[PDB]
Amino acid sequence: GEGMWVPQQLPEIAGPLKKAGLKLSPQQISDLTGDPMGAVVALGGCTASFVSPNGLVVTNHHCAYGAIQLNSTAENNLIKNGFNAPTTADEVSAGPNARVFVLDEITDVTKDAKAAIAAAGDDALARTKALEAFEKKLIADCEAEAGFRCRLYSFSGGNTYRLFKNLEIKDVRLAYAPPGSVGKFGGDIDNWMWPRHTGDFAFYRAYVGKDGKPAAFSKDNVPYQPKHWLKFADQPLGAGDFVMVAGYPGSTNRYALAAEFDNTAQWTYPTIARHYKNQIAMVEAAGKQNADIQVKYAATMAGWNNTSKNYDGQLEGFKRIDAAGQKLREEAAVLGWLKGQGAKGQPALDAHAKLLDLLEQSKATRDRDLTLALFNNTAMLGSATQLYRLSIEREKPNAERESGYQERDLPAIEGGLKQLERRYVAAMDRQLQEYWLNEYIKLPADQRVAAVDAWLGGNDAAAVKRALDRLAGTKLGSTEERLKWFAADRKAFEASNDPAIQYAVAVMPTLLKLEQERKTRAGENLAARPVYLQALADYKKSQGEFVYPDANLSLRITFGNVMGYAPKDGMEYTPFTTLEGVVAKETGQDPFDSPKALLDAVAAKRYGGLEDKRIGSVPVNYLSDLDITGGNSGSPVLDAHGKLVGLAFDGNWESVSSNWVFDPKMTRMIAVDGRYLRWIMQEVYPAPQLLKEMNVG
Amino acid sequence: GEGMWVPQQLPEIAGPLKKAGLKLSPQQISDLTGDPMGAVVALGGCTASFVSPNGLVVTNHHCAYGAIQLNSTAENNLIKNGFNAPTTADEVSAGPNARVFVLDEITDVTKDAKAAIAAAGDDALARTKALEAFEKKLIADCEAEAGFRCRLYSFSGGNTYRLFKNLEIKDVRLAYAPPGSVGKFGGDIDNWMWPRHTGDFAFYRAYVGKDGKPAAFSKDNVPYQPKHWLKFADQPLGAGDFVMVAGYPGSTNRYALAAEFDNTAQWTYPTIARHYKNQIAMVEAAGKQNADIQVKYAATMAGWNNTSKNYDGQLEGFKRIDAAGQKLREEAAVLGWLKGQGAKGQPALDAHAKLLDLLEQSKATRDRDLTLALFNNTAMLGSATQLYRLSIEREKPNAERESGYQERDLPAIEGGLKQLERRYVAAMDRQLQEYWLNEYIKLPADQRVAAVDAWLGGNDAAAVKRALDRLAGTKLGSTEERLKWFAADRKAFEASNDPAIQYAVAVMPTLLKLEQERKTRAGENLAARPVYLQALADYKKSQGEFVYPDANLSLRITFGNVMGYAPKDGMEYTPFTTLEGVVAKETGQDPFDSPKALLDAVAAKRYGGLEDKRIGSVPVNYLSDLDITGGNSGSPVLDAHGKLVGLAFDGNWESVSSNWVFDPKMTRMIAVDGRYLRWIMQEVYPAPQLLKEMNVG
Ligand SMILES: [Zn+2]
Ligand SMILES: [Zn+2]
Ligand SMILES: [Zn+2]
Ligand SMILES: [Zn+2]
């Protein structure tokens, strides 16, 4: 059912957990470094879990896609072929930026954080800087132990703060990926849909130095030895059975002003989707010519497709449940309620009014803000602006450097400049730069940026053509030039005749100014958010409704049962799909081109000891009424005894609008059954070594 | 499950009926003139049933659609608005050709029929005329009793013959029709489809003279008093519950040569579907501009739509089950099994060869024969040819007149010429003439007809236009002119300068020659068909398959249970639809434009005492695994206690290929629930008088 519960709400959910079928004690689930919860890891935007005493980590194929794509060429395509390491020495690096975060400690720091905020009094910008400074000091102290990375999280609009401390494993290697026609069966056509037949799984292995402490990749590193790992279930999962997920959902917007919704529905989602589709169309074309561009842009393409379809789905789901309406009506009913109680409910009503006006302000510049951000996110301009900004920050004491540009951020900065090599083709980026300049000029005169106007020299196809011709002369295209500038000082940047670096030096004053304009808006928000959101919460409780914070990349638990859903009268989707369903979709053409070995194993009913009698086949994917969102991919699904029964990977089509308005009847998780993982590793793309390592072969 | 069982097979299904849940005794079902089977009546291409002691008859809306249309004008459109007669005096005539046939007696005449055939000797044409003369004599004798109509049926390829005698009620009146948006909710989009949300019912009343004997329409007639009628169930019908249907299915082709299947799938269905869709397109377009064309052609259009869509569905279903391959392997098996049996198999092997050759003879002229038949089926040429043929037949003694042109057929002929007034517009028929002339001209030289070529006097657009301009001079457009010709003698036809009459005179010799050829092939078929089809039956029994004859418009029983079906992996169709499903489809545009009173009543949750708590709503339609086909529309669905729980009306999309190859998993009946008939008649288009008369008031 509904809810992305913090581990500190376990007393609240203990009884519901039992009634749904948990046979572990609430005590045991509360131990976030115990069995099974201490096996669950964050990847940074995906979840994963340990599944052996030797550092084997299982997650989704689409979570590993980055790493597979980084190790792929046109002439050895791991995306297409799969990857299997018969020995641990065979495992390839997942990339310098790849991480496994293992939870160490959570501490409430709420009292301190709102002190530091308040201690700045009544200046918006000062309030932001004070929280920044408080956070930086906390983290610096927590990370004083070598091998840990820490994070500060704000919950429920700033009514609670907690500090998380993680062991940061920095040497992650790929151990196994099934072929792309298994890992991503049905491609973007089946994405966000049920029935689903997708084998969305892949394995990493986590490594540290011989001292047992985190290190960056080296051939002298050895497998991490986790305290806790998950075991595969020994009881077959069926319809109605208890399941739970723990993992790291990224963001939801269930506490929001109605106007935040209208802006998103009417403007944000349609605009981003259109841009994303236009870039897809350009890259698609050029990659059909050019396998190098096709392989190099595949991860980018996957992201664009996935977010744009998600937003198409949210727009449709708003109309289906009249989200605009529901928002309006709970807002009216909450404003009603507040004046309602006069004296006590005036602080909250004030808040509503500030928040509301803050939103109109970001509204005034939203097209500028988006366009400029995405223009600067193309490869060479992104590289130049980041690298120049770093040279500026490096001049300050580390404690005053912008988050993202402190010493602790250098590994990821350097790592990103190297990874870019496998994701950049200059003919392709030129077309994206073009696309975004064409969209910049389109902007109205009041919505423009002075410094970009000047840099460009006029509002036409001619100037665009000149810009593009000039930028083409950058040397930032090679990893080696990027890494030179990573190390260069600010004067060296301002001296450069590189045209990409000239662009950055040109616009940075504006970007720092706009960043201040953002930090100031955030500061006013930091006053008004928590009071109003605390009132939304209080109302919800007065209505008997479930109360939990919007997602924020921190660890959450969701639970429920295996069950399908009914999209229309006269029909129902069943909780499982089956092997036969995979082969029924076969067309021999991407994305419905399963391996021959699958096709033959199924035609022969070779179920490998994995059939579930109740469905007369091996289960492939299943639905359940858990409450997950982006960031939950790869999260392990556990059964009533805490055994692994699948991996979360997607949502059904009608679920996605639940980011704003939760609909219990149509919100389902889509998970890959652990028996399908097993079946693939036995009969299709075999990995007898990993199975034996997991005590299932 | 499978099987269109003849009543004489009740001993064989008694056990299976009990196991399925029938609580009536099988002997109570064996009494075809008792309770409840004597309540089931034939309409002539639909089924219906008595539901009161005062002659109230219930059938489908689409069955009554011809009669609703005949009583409709552009200005007062009953298809659109519904009809309700508050007292029996307000009932309107269903039209002169409307019938209710009440089963009186069934006789086996197999031995006598086969002896009439054998006495003809070797000659194929004499064999046909001998069976014809046998049938005519039998029917004349049986119809000696005033008010009875009799029919001879051939079963299992001529291995069995039965005579049916029916009371022929000839004054049928319309007592109630819901609005078309109920009766045909979802129109042609939902036709042949589940989920289905269609209130497909209507009521007639049956009338006789004051002396109790059937009579044509008169104000002095009074309601028929049936010996038996159905009662509405007092127990709520649920999933898995027993249901049975009795009705009059028209035709199936489950006993067929592989070649007959191949010709049908490759040529017959695609060809007819194309011609029907071309005509639909013209009439649709013209009716958009002319609401008299729209109302006059509505019944014709509903047939074209229903058949063409049926044919599309069969072809898709043949691919789904590989019907071609199944027919090829079954035939290789049967011919194997026969060669297996030495000498005693030889007559079936020879029969198979002869049947195959006769199929080839048909095929050689199939384009000509189809095209010529459908050209002559347009309104004026069909009238002219029919009437001219009648004038020729009238010069022979009645016993020698062609079936359809005997004295017993005169009421139907006459009624046809009157009903056509409400189904003909010159400017529309002209376009249909033009379509068929353009198709005629596409025929190749060996498929042309000399008489039509000469009459056409050219092969191009200009000749077509001259022929149309010539035919537009007919006076057969008017009912009175048609009835004049109905009475006129042959010399008057041959003297006429009416251009449609002249056409009929010109082509008649050719039609008669073609009829002789068809009679000749039928006579050859009479010899070979029984022997082969007996072998097919014997083979099926040796494989332990069900053995029942193909449908042939006689009374059949089918039984099974309420149940949905699974169209693909990860999905199921549920056995019921509900009221909320009807409203979910609402668009306010035909065909998804329910009566406002329906939308209001569902919104207000006015369930009228008819809610089934197990589905949370009033049921609308349901699925069951019964075996029905064309002709079964209007058949009552009985529960375990013989009570009325719905009306058969359609099949699901995947079912329709069961006319050739039975598929148990995807073959379902779609029925309208008796509770939905009641609910509509309470809350939406009310008829308290009829509910009272059925005592559910
Ligand atoms: Zn247990
Ligand atoms: Zn250089
Ligand atoms: Zn006349
Ligand atoms: Zn009973």
Curated annotation (Swiss-Prot), chains A, B:
Keyword tRNA processing attached: no
Q: What is the effect of changing residue 62 to A?
A: Loss of enzymatic activity. Loss of enzymatic activity
* Keyword Protease among record annotations: yes
Key words of the record = Aminopeptidase, Disulfide bond, Hydrolase, Protease, Signal
Cystine pairings recorded for this chain: 46-63, 142-150
Active-site annotation: 62 (charge relay system), 200 (charge relay system), 633 (charge relay system)
Per UniProt, what does mutating residue 650 to A do?
Loss of enzymatic activity
Q: Which residues bind substrate?
A: 191-192, 306, 631-633, 649-650
Note the effect listed for residue 550 to A. Decreased enzymatic activity to 83 percent relative to wild-type
The biological process GO terms on file are: proteolysis involved in protein catabolic process
Q: Name one Pfam family in it.
A: Peptidase_S46
Biotechnological applications listed in the UniProt record:
Designing engineered forms of this protein with the ability to produce custom dipeptides potentially may have a number of commercial and industrial uses including food industry. Maybe useful for drug design.
Provide the activity regulation entry from the record: Completely inhibited by the serine protease inhibitor diisopropyl fluorophosphate (DFP) and potently inhibited by 0.5 mM ZnCl(2), 10 mM o-phenanthlorine, phenylmethanesulfonyl fluoride (PMSF) and N-tosyl-L-phenyl-alanyl chloromethyl ketone (TPCK), but not by N-tosyl-L-lysyl chloromethyl ketone (TLCK). Activity is not affected significantly by protease inhibitors, such as chymostatin, leupeptin, N-ethylmaleimide (NEM), iodoacetate (IAA), L-trans-epoxysuccinyl-leucylamido(4-guanido)butane (E64) and pepstatin A or by CoCl(2), CaCl(2) and EDTA.
Q: How does activity depend on pH?
A: Optimum pH is 8 for the hydrolysis of Gly-Phe-pNA.
What is the E.C. number? 3.4.14.-
- Record function comment: Exopeptidase that catalyzes the removal of dipeptide units (NH2-P2-P1-) from the free amino termini of oligopeptides and small proteins. Peptide digestion is sequential and substrate recognition is non-specific, with the exception that Pro is not suitable as a P1 residue. Removes many residues of bioactive oligopeptides such as angiotensin I and neuromedin N and also cleaves oxidized insulin B chain. Able to hydrolyze an X-Pro bond, an imido bond. No endopeptidase activity. May play a physiological role in feeding.
- What is said about the domains? The chymotrypsin fold (25-276 and 574-722) is the catalytic domain and the alpha-helical domain (277-573) is the regulatory domain necessary for exopeptidase activity.
Q: Which family does it belong to?
A: Belongs to the peptidase S46 family.
Q: Mind telling me what this protein is named?
A: Dipeptidyl aminopeptidase BII
Q: What is the lineage of its organism?
A: Bacteria, Pseudomonadati, Pseudomonadota, Gammaproteobacteria, Lysobacterales
